Amino acid sequence: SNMWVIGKNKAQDAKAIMVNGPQFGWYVPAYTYGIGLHGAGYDVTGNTPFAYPGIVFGHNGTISWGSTAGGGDDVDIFAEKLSAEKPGYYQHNGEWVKMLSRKETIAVKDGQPETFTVWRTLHGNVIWTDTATQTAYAKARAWDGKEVASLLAWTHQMKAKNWPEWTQQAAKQALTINWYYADVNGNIGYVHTGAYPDRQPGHDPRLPVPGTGKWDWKGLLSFDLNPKVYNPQSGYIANWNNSPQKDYPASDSFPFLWGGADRVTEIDTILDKQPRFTADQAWDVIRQTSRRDLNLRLFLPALKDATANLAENDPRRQLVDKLASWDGENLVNDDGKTYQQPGSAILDAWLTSMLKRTVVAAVPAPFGKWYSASGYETTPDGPTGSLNISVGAKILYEALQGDKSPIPQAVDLFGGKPQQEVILAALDDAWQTLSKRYGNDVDSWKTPAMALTWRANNFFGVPQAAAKEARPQAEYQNRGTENDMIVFSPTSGNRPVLAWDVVAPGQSGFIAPDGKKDKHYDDQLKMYESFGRKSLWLTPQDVDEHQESQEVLQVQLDQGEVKIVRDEYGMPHIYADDTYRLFYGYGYVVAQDRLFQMEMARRSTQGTVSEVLGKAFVSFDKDIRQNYWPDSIRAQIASLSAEDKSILQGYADGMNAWIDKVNASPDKLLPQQFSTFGFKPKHWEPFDVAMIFVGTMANRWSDSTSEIDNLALLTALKDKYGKQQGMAVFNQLKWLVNPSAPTTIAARESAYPLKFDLQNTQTA
Ligand SMILES: [Ca+2]
């Protein structure tokens, strides 16, 4: 997910420009949903994942906002001490506390039900039980009990009109998410939002902690500690899942690192090269970064050095010369199947061999395979997500920097041999594999282009469309699933704010019972591929001028009225006078456009897919039910103010108003996929609505930990290198902080004050 916010001092013909490209993968129907809300204090336009009541990507005429995943460490694992004689009890503060438990049965269409029990302790749900050590590992999220509040903070921030008002909602968003701000006066800002634990001294957040009491969190850190910047000296805020600020620690996941090698530098390079950007140039950064090879910039200096004494007759030299004449941009040939230059295939083969010889060799099996990927891994279907610098490559980059790197190399990744020797040896392996395939002349190689697929299964692996709806795209583009731009105070024109977005394949996922696709089923698919965009309307004049349909709806609760106006791309605009009615119109239009997708997202987020699709989804259903506690979500809803509750209730009731019309005349209104898969849509509740957010936002982007795997790795590293050196190798592969990491907030602005204790920890 990427973002670039350009302020007053860096914007040309405008006061501020915001460009967001969140990366969620490619699906049909679209991952995000375009929506306009007007009334009850709301006047907002934009698009949002899974049609959440809160619009994640948008603006309100005064401020614009967006987000990328935060990548912080908000999840810790508590190793609970089990009892030999007491089943279902654990030790906390000298006593034997009983575990909460709940029994679940997964109903299976044409199959056998599957029963199991989910366990929960004061730390969280139990994710794993090791009988040998009598340990139950419990997952503690700093945001547990704040799921519904995080959804409502995203909804209320839509009404903010300045920095203090917006940061007040940013403080109530408990998930690890980067939030961005821009306004009509040219002010830009950034907050790395979330609830983060206040840990005991010597708590290494990369490894599990005993859950007996001595290591329980002292509570949560204050919002004052969260990295934030307002109008940075640089005049821009750029992010591509990189570090928010100097000394700020990343998530404990072993593949996730923030080091000297970071893809955000690709955006920083473009933004620093010129002093001012127009709206069209800011948007063009998408085209540029989408085609950028991320490894050329990192390894070309070492490759030129290793082949400096070679003449042009040497094949290893011919490979580096081909890389040295390349601009790093990948373009597809007229055939639609191959790249114009072979550089990425050369870097892929070289990196794969380099990693086998360096990082993979140093790490004992079966942990070596964790650092073997080159970052180019793809199938004929194309990459399912973004392309990044791999974890192995990030560690290899530190070793290549050597002296320049702040990471102590506790083990020489080059195993005694000089690095030039290893670099030429990997180049020879790359030459051998690539010449066997394309012949001995590098100038004639037509290497395969990465393709893209708009998947008919959601990110969970569950159908959200018939398989036949999957669409191919010849060019893979390392860009957002959607891209949106907001331009504040443009010098040209009679509008104080301009916005655009692209929601492909289209605004609608509706396919009629006879197979007829809606007019807005795929009318944005070609616009996406060609880096085009469509206008986002906010004012009633713009909405009414570009309208295509207009209808009134009578809310079933109070016979009140809601006006729905759809634009030329099918994007609905809701007009209502109270909170309940507003969200009722929203849920109603979601049910008209994305019923089959939302119903499948509902079953995916609650683990009820097998009920309608069969035994294939049983392990998926079980794992979803094991990863949440329904009573906590229901308690969070039950304790909402009447205003916050009307948002969820209105939305659910609005969906039910359309579902009833659908079930009254299925032969004309039932989405075709309900007939293809053999079931009917049913009513939604505020629970269902909250669980779409929890299951697809909190669980997908804010629930990442690999502490148990980290412990297994550290245990093997101590076995190989000894207790002392093994821990120092762990600090070289999975460092807590790396000061050379490119950061969204400049070091000049501020740094993370919280320093961590290395000596004496839970691993002593
Ligand atoms: Ca952690």
Cα distance between residue 566 and residue 572, in whole Å: 4
Main-chain dihedrals φ then ψ at residue 641, nearest 5 degrees: -65, 160
Ligand 1 centroid–CA 203 distance in Å is: 9
Cα distance between residue 360 and residue 366, in whole Å: 10
Method: X-ray
Ligand 1 centroid–CA 329 distance in Å is: 37
Ligand 1 centroid–CA 202 distance in Å is: 13
Ligand 1 centroid–CA 334 distance in Å is: 48
Report which secondary-structure segment, H or E, holds 220.
none
Can you state the angle between helices 315-324 and 296-306, rounded to 10 degrees?
Answer: 140
Ligand 1 centroid–CA 251 distance in Å is: 6
In the numeric block, the tokens 């000394």 are attached to 247
Ligand 1 centroid–CA 737 distance in Å is: 13
Dihedral Cα 18, 23, 27, 32, nearest 10 deg: -40
Cα distance between residue 602 and residue 690, in whole Å: 10
Look at residue 192 and give its three-state secondary structure.
strand
Ligand 1 centroid–CA 661 distance in Å is: 48
Ligand 1 centroid–CA 276 distance in Å is: 40
Ligand 1 centroid–CA 210 distance in Å is: 13
CA dist 21 → 69, 115, 380, 684 (Å): 12, 41, 24, 31
* Two tokens, residue 301: 């200096």
Ligand 1 centroid–CA 208 distance in Å is: 8
Cα distance between residue 486 and residue 20, in whole Å: 9
* Two tokens, residue 126: 């139990």
1 carries an active-site annotation: yes
Report which secondary-structure segment, H or E, holds 473.
strand 471-473
Beta bridge partners, 564, equal 551, 574
Sheet holding 534-535, edge to edge: 236-239, 2-6, 16-21, 483-488, 497-502, 534-535
End-to-end CA distance of the chain: 38
Ligand 1 centroid–CA 373 distance in Å is: 24
Cα distance between residue 665 and residue 683, in whole Å: 16
Contact 1, 23 (CB under 8 A): yes
Ligand 1 centroid–CA 588 distance in Å is: 40
Options 1, 234, 253, 290, the catalytic residue: 1
Cα distance between residue 450 and residue 383, in whole Å: 8
In the numeric block, the tokens 């297994």 are attached to 712
The dihedral of CA 84, 86, 88, 89: what is its sign?
negative
Radius of gyration (C-alpha) of the chain in whole angstroms: 27
Q: Which of 121, 49, 113, 27 is nearest to 82 (CA)?
A: 121
Kindly provide the resolution of this structure in angstroms, with one decimal. 2.2
Report which secondary-structure segment, H or E, holds 54.
none
Q: Which residues of 479-491 are buried (b: 16+ CB within 10 A; e: fewer)?
A: bbbbbbbbbbbbe
Name 320's Cβ contacts closer than 8 Å, sequence gap at least 6. Answer: 300, 303, 304, 306, 307, 427
Cα distance between residue 280 and residue 263, in whole Å: 22
Look at residue 170 and give its three-state secondary structure.
helix
Ligand 1 centroid–CA 707 distance in Å is: 7
Cα distance between residue 258 and residue 69, in whole Å: 14
Cα distance between residue 341 and residue 322, in whole Å: 9
Ligand 1 centroid–CA 77 distance in Å is: 7
Contact 270, 285 (CB under 8 A): yes
Look at residue 399 and give its three-state secondary structure.
helix
- Cis bond upstream, residue 29 (ω within 30): yes
Q: Exposure of 124 by Cβ count < 10 A (0-12 exposed, 13-18 middle, 19+ buried)?
A: buried
Ligand 1 centroid–CA 480 distance in Å is: 28
Contact 199, 205 (CB under 8 A): yes
Report which secondary-structure segment, H or E, holds 645.
helix 642-664
Ligand 1 centroid–CA 675 distance in Å is: 45
